[PDB]
Chains A and B, each alone.
Chain A
Amino acid sequence: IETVPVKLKPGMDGPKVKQWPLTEEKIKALVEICTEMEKEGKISKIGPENPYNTPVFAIKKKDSTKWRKLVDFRELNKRTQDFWEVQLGIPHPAGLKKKKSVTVLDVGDAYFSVPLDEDFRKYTAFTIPSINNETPGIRYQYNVLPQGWKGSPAIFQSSMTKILEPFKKQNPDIVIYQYMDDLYVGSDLEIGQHRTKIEELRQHLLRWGLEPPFLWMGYELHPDKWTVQPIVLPEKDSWTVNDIQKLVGKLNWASQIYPGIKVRQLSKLLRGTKALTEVIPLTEEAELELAENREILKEPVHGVYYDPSKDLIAEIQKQGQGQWTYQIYQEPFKNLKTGKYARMRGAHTNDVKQLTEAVQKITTESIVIWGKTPKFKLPIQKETWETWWTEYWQATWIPEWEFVNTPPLVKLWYQ
């Protein structure tokens, strides 16, 4: 009810980010949402003395027909002070990633009850554009904590602890973690038990509020069933020349990760200039090198540790037939997590939808494990991604990304 002082980083201006083009359907949805928000005092119209801007668009959350406004505060988030005044941070709960079920709740609506510092509001400016620029875009700024700004969970944090006090006291085994507009709630119960404690949790926030449009929904995760990817080699009875070349290639690649991988015995087997499809019997020496390589690959990689002072990088490879592989790391060859996807819903003829869903899943996994989002290296042309990703986005945060324009040879090794 009383403002927290907020400033930008030293020697740093407000965002001046261009609004990207919006479809007719989204413009209309945003006009209706914002007209309602304005009557509720959440936002106010601004004049031309405010030169700042942040893009806005609209999404449909996963399994609903109602539009949600999303503001791309990425630039504002970079330029906003860091928030360590009461807390150096919320030490990321390492137990969250071991619950059998973790549900994600959109609690962003609760932020709208806290006024935003009067001197900072101008920096939250945004524009609803009009088709063909036929009328001036509608300019607003926030009067209350906006969804998607990093300061909102930080400023609301004291109020959140208090609302959850009774539920924490009564269900002490539950792990509750807040990231931006999301609440992650992890338990070890069976799904019906779980769904009912989740609904229990909702009650406390309807209770405190007295209505949140997207508080009812629940995205169900199972991090204990999260599968990984060690490096495995084929098991064959007949090896062709081609088979052995692919094996030596993969092993050469693995040797950058694992110290003692050897290929010299296997590379001997290629001696001669044989047809690619000719079967080569393995020598005893080769069989032994192969077996010892197999043993090495069954152990964890050496000297791999997460460093919170460094960014997480996520790489993704398109493997074909709806399958995607990805690795998360901070230093080359020191993977912190690898994985694979194939489940990509209603996207069997749409690569870009599949990739956009992959990005959101990987980002969710990153939040649960480390409490932050990775920087993606996307196997896609920038113009294709920028034109389409907002049509399949269902998350309330947005990660950073760059584009890969040269085909990686390592695709072959994660397949």
Chain B
Amino acid sequence: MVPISPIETVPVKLKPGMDGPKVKQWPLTEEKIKALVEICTEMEKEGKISKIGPENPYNTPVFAIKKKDSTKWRKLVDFRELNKRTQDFWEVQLGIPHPAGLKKKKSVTVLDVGDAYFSVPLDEDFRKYTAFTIPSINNETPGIRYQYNVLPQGWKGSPAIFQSSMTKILEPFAAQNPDIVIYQYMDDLYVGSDLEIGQHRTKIEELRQHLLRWGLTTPDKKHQKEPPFLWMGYELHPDKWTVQPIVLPEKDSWTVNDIQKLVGKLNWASQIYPGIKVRQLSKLLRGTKALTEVIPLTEEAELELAENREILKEPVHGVYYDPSKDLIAEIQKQGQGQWTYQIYQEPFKNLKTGKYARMRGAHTNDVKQLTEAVQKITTESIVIWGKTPKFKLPIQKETWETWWTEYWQATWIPEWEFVNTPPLVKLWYQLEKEPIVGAETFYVDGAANRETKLGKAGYVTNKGRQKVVPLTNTTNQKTELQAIYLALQDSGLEVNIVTDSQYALGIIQAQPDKSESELVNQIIEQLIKKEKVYLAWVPAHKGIGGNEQVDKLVSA
């Protein structure tokens, strides 16, 4: 015989304080019992399991499931209880590669390593916890007791330990053959290269021989799976990729659960189909989660669906990453807080696409949203490609300069250039830094009675203009904004406004261009019409003339 290197076992423990499982074996039919004894006898000769004595106090139930449309039963050891008691492991598969970060390959070969999986021994001190019992016929003898010697299918630790064992075996081959890539998924190894077809098969045969060192045999009759690959919802080809087909059903009426998987398909599609939109369809899921409720689609959600159908009419494809070239990211504004982007290296050949959606918030503006989309794309690009793309943004260089130099927060966006494709992001208004000479000065105030919710809002000016308006079903904060709105509505193109509302200044100093509050939107609309606005703050209740006069008018 040829000696084979043993695979180092991983030490495994139970969670602190826990013992192994002691779960009752379910009673089985004489028919099922016979099937299991055959399966287990063969597994025992293969070395996978071993008969044990009666001292071992642990147990996990075993079942016999009819493989559909066959007379053949198959064994299921139900490890759910042991899995609850087993320690946590490091799981490596948490991040799956994105196709747009992969590199072009001339050849990709698949090798079956399914027999490899039980060459992996189980830590000897842990095997006792895997005990299971085949019941005996008629319960007239003790059950046949076994434990595992190898990683069992269904045990919590098998994926991580299998993957880490295979990775360690493959590391020297990969390190000493940098012209190939190796990727393990389930019971297969995928081996890619740009080598000439003969060199590539030579590397394959060398990998087969390297694997033999550990006694791992690979099927000679080469794999049925061949490019393209269906993988993780994608279709991988040698030099292109796409998502698996996106089909949107025709439906006369839509349920909550239908809409959930529509939004599901559309998000998946958005990584290569440009311009996918989901705001209006996600709106139909606001709040409620009664999975069978039918929702009438708004006229707005019907339009969005229609535009999505149009986008999905034809297949698109993505290309793979070329490390020798820069990444470019281009972003467009779509409306209602929605943004779409494309990432490419040569014009018109996208590596991938994507979208970004406004965060739920009281007030917002386009520049902040653009800024957030840029940071999200930056972060995704670091993951996929390890570098920041250069950005093409629909905002003028001077608009950006004005924004970040005056904004109260620190903010930054990485190297970028203006692309002149409407709609452009712009600043709709900017407050003055100093009081305006010759402009009328409006002292504004409002107040409300918290019991009856009656209030007043108004102003007085240095020219003797005055206005007080009675209000119903209102609050102090609403009346403070109403007063500012009245001053904006009744003034000329240049106006100084004096308020004592910290609340109103908080909003205005955040420079929204759109709000959840229709009162704030009205204020924004007025601000856009002005040429100059200076907004001054004073503390309340201090004897401040002007303020002190209209405080007495509106709080009466």
Task: List residues of chain A with CB within 8 A of the CB of B489.
Answer: none
Proximity string of chain A (10-35) to chain B, C-beta cutoff 8 Å, 1 when within and 0 when not: 00000000000111100100000000
Task: List residues of chain B with CB within 8 A of the CB of A232.
Answer: none
Q: Given that A132-B384, A134-B183 are known contacts, is A381 also in contact with B409, CB under 8 Å in the complex? A: yes
Task: List residues of chain B with CB within 8 A of the CB of A375.
Answer: none
Instruction: Establish whether residues B97 and A132, one from each chain, have CB atoms under 8 Å apart when the complex forms.
Output: yes
Query: In the assembled complex, how far is the CB of residue B458 from the closest CB belonging to chain A, in whole angstroms?
Result: 13
Instruction: Establish whether residues A409 and B537, one from each chain, have CB atoms under 8 Å apart when the complex forms.
Output: yes
* Residues from 506 to 556 in B contacting A, C-beta threshold 8 Å: 506, 509-510, 534, 536-539, 542-549
Complex Cα distance, B378 from A263, in Å, reads 51
With an 8 A cutoff between CB atoms, is B485 at the interface?
A: no
* Residues from 361 to 407 in B contacting A, C-beta threshold 8 Å: 368, 371-372, 375-376, 378-379, 382-388, 404-406
Instruction: Establish whether residues A383 and B409, one from each chain, have CB atoms under 8 Å apart when the complex forms.
Output: no
Q: Given that A133-B95, A276-B498, A409-B537 are known contacts, is A268 also in contact with B543, CB under 8 Å in the complex? A: yes
With an 8 A cutoff between CB atoms, is B461 at the interface?
A: yes
With an 8 A cutoff between CB atoms, is B153 at the interface?
A: no
Which of B376, B385, B462, B545 has the largest number of chain A CB atoms within 10 A? B545
Complex Cα distance, B407 from A379, in Å, reads 10
Query: In the assembled complex, how far is the CB of residue A164 from the closest CB belonging to chain B, in whole angstroms?
Result: 40
With an 8 A cutoff between CB atoms, is A77 at the interface?
A: no
Q: How many A residues, CB 8 Å from partner?
A: 61
The chain A residue with its CB closest to the CB of B401 is A349
* Residues from 206 to 259 in A contacting B, C-beta threshold 8 Å: 240-242, 245, 248-249, 252
Instruction: Establish whether residues A384 and B181, one from each chain, have CB atoms under 8 Å apart when the complex forms.
Output: no
Complex Cα distance, B385 from A136, in Å, reads 16
Instruction: Identify which of B10, B368, B435, B539 contacts A276 (C-beta below 8 A).
Output: B435
Q: Given that A49-B12, A136-B92 are known contacts, is A273 also in contact with B538, CB under 8 Å in the complex? A: no
Complex Cα distance, B411 from A318, in Å, reads 11
With an 8 A cutoff between CB atoms, is A380 at the interface?
A: yes
Task: List residues of chain B with CB within 8 A of the CB of A381.
Answer: 368, 371-372, 409, 411
Instruction: Identify which of A276, A278, A379 contacts B408 (C-beta below 8 A).
Output: A379
* Residues from 357 to 382 in A contacting B, C-beta threshold 8 Å: 378-381
Complex Cα distance, B506 from A275, in Å, reads 24
Task: List residues of chain B with CB within 8 A of the CB of A252.
Answer: 539, 542
The chain A residue with its CB closest to the CB of B550 is A273
With an 8 A cutoff between CB atoms, is A351 at the interface?
A: yes
Q: Given that A47-B164, A49-B12, A276-B536 are known contacts, is A132 also in contact with B545, CB under 8 Å in the complex? A: no
Proximity string of chain A (345-357) to chain B, C-beta cutoff 8 Å, 1 when within and 0 when not: 0000011111100
Instruction: Identify which of B11, B97, B546 contacts A133 (C-beta below 8 A).
Output: B97
Task: List residues of chain A with CB within 8 A of the CB of B412.
Answer: 350-353, 384, 388
Task: List residues of chain A with CB within 8 A of the CB of B167.
Answer: 136
Which of B10, B87, B410, B436 has the largest number of chain A CB atoms within 10 A? B410
Complex Cα distance, B441 from A273, in Å, reads 8
Which of B12, B95, B164, B506 has the largest number of chain A CB atoms within 10 A? B95
Instruction: Establish whether residues B410 and A354, one from each chain, have CB atoms under 8 Å apart when the complex forms.
Output: yes
Instruction: Establish whether residues A21 and B411, one from each chain, have CB atoms under 8 Å apart when the complex forms.
Output: no
Q: Given that A240-B435, A242-B435, A264-B543 are known contacts, is A407 also in contact with B506, CB under 8 Å in the complex? A: yes
The chain B residue with its CB closest to the CB of A318 is B410
Instruction: Identify which of A48, A139, A378 contacts B10 (C-beta below 8 A).
Output: A48
Q: Given that A48-B10, A384-B375 are known contacts, is A274 also in contact with B510, CB under 8 Å in the complex? A: no
Query: In the assembled complex, how far is the CB of residue B162 from the closest CB belonging to chain A, in whole angstroms?
Result: 9
Instruction: Establish whether residues B548 and A270, one from each chain, have CB atoms under 8 Å apart when the complex forms.
Output: yes
Task: List residues of chain A with CB within 8 A of the CB of B376.
Answer: 383
Task: List residues of chain B with CB within 8 A of the CB of A276.
Answer: 435-436, 441, 496, 498, 534, 536
Instruction: Identify which of B163, B408, B539, B547 contacts A136 (C-beta below 8 A).
Output: B163
Instruction: Establish whether residues A387 and B409, one from each chain, have CB atoms under 8 Å apart when the complex forms.
Output: no
Query: In the assembled complex, how far is the CB of residue B532 from the closest CB belonging to chain A, in whole angstroms?
Result: 12
With an 8 A cutoff between CB atoms, is A137 at the interface?
A: yes
Proximity string of chain B (408-449) to chain A, C-beta cutoff 8 Å, 1 when within and 0 when not: 111110000000000000000000000111001101000000
With an 8 A cutoff between CB atoms, is B56 at the interface?
A: no
Instruction: Establish whether residues B409 and A272, one from each chain, have CB atoms under 8 Å apart when the complex forms.
Output: no
Complex Cα distance, B436 from A276, in Å, reads 8
Task: List residues of chain B with CB within 8 A of the CB of A269.
Answer: 545
Q: Given that A273-B443, A276-B536, A383-B375 are known contacts, is A24 also in contact with B387, CB under 8 Å in the complex? A: yes
Instruction: Identify which of B160, B436, B464, B502 contacts A48 (C-beta below 8 A).
Output: B160
Task: List residues of chain B with CB within 8 A of the CB of A240.
Answer: 435
The chain A residue with its CB closest to the CB of B184 is A136
With an 8 A cutoff between CB atoms, is A411 at the interface?
A: yes
Instruction: Establish whether residues B545 and A270, one from each chain, have CB atoms under 8 Å apart when the complex forms.
Output: yes
Which of A48, A351, A354, A404 has the largest number of chain B CB atoms within 10 A? A48
Complex Cα distance, B405 from A354, in Å, reads 13
Query: In the assembled complex, how far is the CB of residue B169 from the closest CB belonging to chain A, in whole angstroms?
Result: 12
Instruction: Establish whether residues A406 and B506, one from each chain, have CB atoms under 8 Å apart when the complex forms.
Output: yes
Proximity string of chain B (439-469) to chain A, C-beta cutoff 8 Å, 1 when within and 0 when not: 0110100000000000000001110100000
With an 8 A cutoff between CB atoms, is A50 at the interface?
A: yes
Complex Cα distance, B388 from A273, in Å, reads 55
Instruction: Establish whether residues A51 and B90, one from each chain, have CB atoms under 8 Å apart when the complex forms.
Output: yes
Instruction: Establish whether residues A384 and B542, one from each chain, have CB atoms under 8 Å apart when the complex forms.
Output: no
Query: In the assembled complex, how far is the CB of residue B227 from the closest CB belonging to chain A, in whole angstroms?
Result: 18
With an 8 A cutoff between CB atoms, is A271 at the interface?
A: yes
Task: List residues of chain B with CB within 8 A of the CB of A274.
Answer: 441, 462, 545-546
The chain A residue with its CB closest to the CB of B11 is A49
With an 8 A cutoff between CB atoms, is A3 at the interface?
A: no
With an 8 A cutoff between CB atoms, is B161 at the interface?
A: yes
The chain B residue with its CB closest to the CB of A382 is B375
Complex Cα distance, B96 from A414, in Å, reads 49
Instruction: Establish whether residues A380 and B372, one from each chain, have CB atoms under 8 Å apart when the complex forms.
Output: no
Query: In the assembled complex, how far is the CB of residue A353 from the closest CB belonging to chain B, in whole angstroms?
Result: 8
Which of A242, A264, A276, A387 has the largest number of chain B CB atoms within 10 A? A276
Task: List residues of chain A with CB within 8 A of the CB of B13.
Answer: 49
Instruction: Establish whether residues A273 and B549, one from each chain, have CB atoms under 8 Å apart when the complex forms.
Output: yes
Instruction: Establish whether residues A351 and B404, one from each chain, have CB atoms under 8 Å apart when the complex forms.
Output: yes
Task: List residues of chain A with CB within 8 A of the CB of B502.
Answer: 409
With an 8 A cutoff between CB atoms, is B27 at the interface?
A: no
* Residues from 101 to 132 in A contacting B, C-beta threshold 8 Å: 131-132
Complex Cα distance, B408 from A139, in Å, reads 42
Instruction: Identify which of B101, B157, B161, B435 contacts A277 (C-beta below 8 A).
Output: B435
The chain B residue with its CB closest to the CB of A52 is B90
Query: In the assembled complex, how far is the CB of residue A302 from the closest CB belonging to chain B, in whole angstroms?
Result: 22
The chain A residue with its CB closest to the CB of B91 is A48
The chain B residue with its CB closest to the CB of A134 is B97
* Residues from 464 to 494 in B contacting A, C-beta threshold 8 Å: 464
With an 8 A cutoff between CB atoms, is A172 at the interface?
A: no
Instruction: Establish whether residues A272 and B543, one from each chain, have CB atoms under 8 Å apart when the complex forms.
Output: no
Instruction: Establish whether residues A351 and B539, one from each chain, have CB atoms under 8 Å apart when the complex forms.
Output: no
Task: List residues of chain B with CB within 8 A of the CB of A241.
Answer: 441
The chain A residue with its CB closest to the CB of B413 is A384
Query: In the assembled complex, how far is the CB of residue A90 from the closest CB belonging to chain B, in whole angstroms?
Result: 34
With an 8 A cutoff between CB atoms, is B195 at the interface?
A: no
Complex Cα distance, B460 from A354, in Å, reads 43
Q: Given that A136-B163, A242-B536, A355-B410 are known contacts, is A384 also in contact with B371, CB under 8 Å in the complex? A: yes
Complex Cα distance, B461 from A270, in Å, reads 13
Instruction: Establish whether residues A271 and B538, one from each chain, have CB atoms under 8 Å apart when the complex forms.
Output: no
Q: Could you name 20 residue pairs across A and B whose Cβ atoms are closer than 8 Å?
A: A23-B382, A48-B160, A51-B87, A51-B89, A132-B97, A245-B498, A248-B539, A249-B538, A249-B539, A264-B542, A270-B545, A270-B546, A270-B547, A273-B441, A275-B440, A320-B405, A350-B412, A351-B409, A383-B376, A406-B506
Task: List 5 extra interface pairs beyond A131-B385, A135-B174, A273-B443, CB under 8 A.
Answer: A22-B386, A23-B382, A48-B163, A242-B536, A270-B545
Binding site for A on B (CB under 8 A): 10-13, 87-92, 95-98, 101-102, 157, 160-161, 163-164, 167, 174, 181, 183, 368, 371-372, 375-376, 378-379, 382-388, 404-406, 408-412, 435-437, 440-441, 443, 460-462, 464, 496, 498, 502, 505-506, 509-510, 534, 536-539, 542-549
Enumerate the 7 nearest inter-chain pairs by beta-carbon distance, A residue then B residue, closest first: A132-B101, A24-B386, A267-B543, A133-B95, A270-B545, A271-B545, A351-B410
